[PDB]
Amino acid sequence: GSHMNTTVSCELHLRLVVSSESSLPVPAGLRYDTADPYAVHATFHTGAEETVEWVFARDLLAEGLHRPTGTGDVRVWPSRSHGQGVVCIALSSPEGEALLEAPARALESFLKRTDAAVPPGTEHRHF
Amino acid sequence: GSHMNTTVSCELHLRLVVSSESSLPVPAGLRYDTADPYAVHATFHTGAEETVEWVFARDLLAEGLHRPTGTGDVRVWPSRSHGQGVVCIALSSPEALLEAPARALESFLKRTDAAVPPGTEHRH
Amino acid sequence: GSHMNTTVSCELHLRLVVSSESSLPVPAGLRYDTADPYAVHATFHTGAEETVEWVFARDLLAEGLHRPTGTGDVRVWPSRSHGQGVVCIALSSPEGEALLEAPARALESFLKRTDAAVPPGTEHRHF
């Protein structure tokens, strides 16, 4: 008998930025697992019975609330839209390039709950 | 940051063929994961708080829409029942006969093919 | 195609024993997988969008209905509280020490369903 994992989750409503004047709604689930303490797992509901799963560095999403960050597949930066603070998530794959807007307040509140489970700087205690 | 997986799923109502006289309803989930691109995962809801999980070759379900196929644990073949096309799924472990509605099965496989065309699985 | 797994599950209501006179409700999901025939997986719903996952030896929970058992992370023993038979579950991790009360009848009824799927003594047939 042993403690395998603690999970912190939330549901966010993201916007897929199609154009300057057009966006599509993308419900997303975020999960944090204390057994994988550097990571955040994201499920993007891109269709009724379709999902796309991405893994992010928790520290990249945390930094993305305050300043532009990331190289390679993922670029993150803060901004505002429709009178809300947002985190912009630019994703590159073999398939192509997508731009998503996450509500900053909801993202930050989820990261604060992950910090209560595993304070940043203590991830190594779990490995 | 990295793309771990794309999932395509559907919910089917299958018929457990108990006998010629009587059959039972089995709600099932099918899921295709591009991280496991040769496979289809099936969850058979056999009881209120009970499931049976099977893994199939995608290509076996795809072939089963058109002709009889499989040896060992799984045999699949097309047929008709109550005026609908069905795929018959015979499963052996240490035996169950299931009927899947062909249209719904085929439309799920076509969505998996749009994500990963058969023949390209190895690119993933 | 291969028959990966058969799952037997139940939802129980456990009491987290905070104090002599104070307890908190912990909804818990128990899952038995015939592909992992020695184990019971427990999900403790400790808040709206947080869970704590534990693995137990099925045989430890089974023994815990009848007598005190376990060394290390998990200690289990039968008892009574508010006139109902309970199994006491004491859990230790680097993170936490917890005392939980499970209703004995409901726990036993779940284990009997796992025994109908994989009778104790036959776990090895699955490997």
Residue numbers in the entry:
A (entry chain BBB), C (entry chain AAA): -2 to 124
B (entry chain CCC): -2 to 91, 94 to 123
What does the paper say about this structure?
In the filamentous bacterium Streptomyces, cell division is positively controlled by SsgB, which recruits FtsZ to the future septum sites and promotes Z-ring formation. Instead, a positive control system has evolved, whereby FtsZ is actively recruited to the septum sites by SsgB, in concert with its paralogue SsgA. SsgB is the archetypical SALP, with a conserved function in the development of actinomycetes. The SsgA-like proteins (SALPs) are a family of regulatory proteins that is unique in sporulating actinobacteria.
In order to gain more insights into the structure–function relationship for key SsgB residues, the structure of S. coelicolor SsgB (ScSsgB) was resolved via X-ray crystallography. The 13 aa residues at the C-terminus were highly mobile and could therefore not be modelled, owing to lack of electron density. ScSsgB trimer adopts a ‘whirly’ shape and is assembled through an antiparallel β-sheet interaction between β1 from one subunit and β4 from the neighbouring subunit. By contrast, the Tf SsgB trimer is assembled mainly through α-helices. Residues V115, G118 and E120 cluster together, and are centered on the lid of the beta-barrel consisting of α1, α2–α3 and β1–β2 loop, which is close to the interface between α3 and the rest of the subunit. Residue E120 plays a key role in maintaining the proper angle between α3 and the rest of the protein. Three hydrogen bonds are formed between the E120 side chain and the main chains of E120, T119 and G118 in the α2–α3 loop region. Besides, E120 and V115 provide two additional salt bridges to R55.
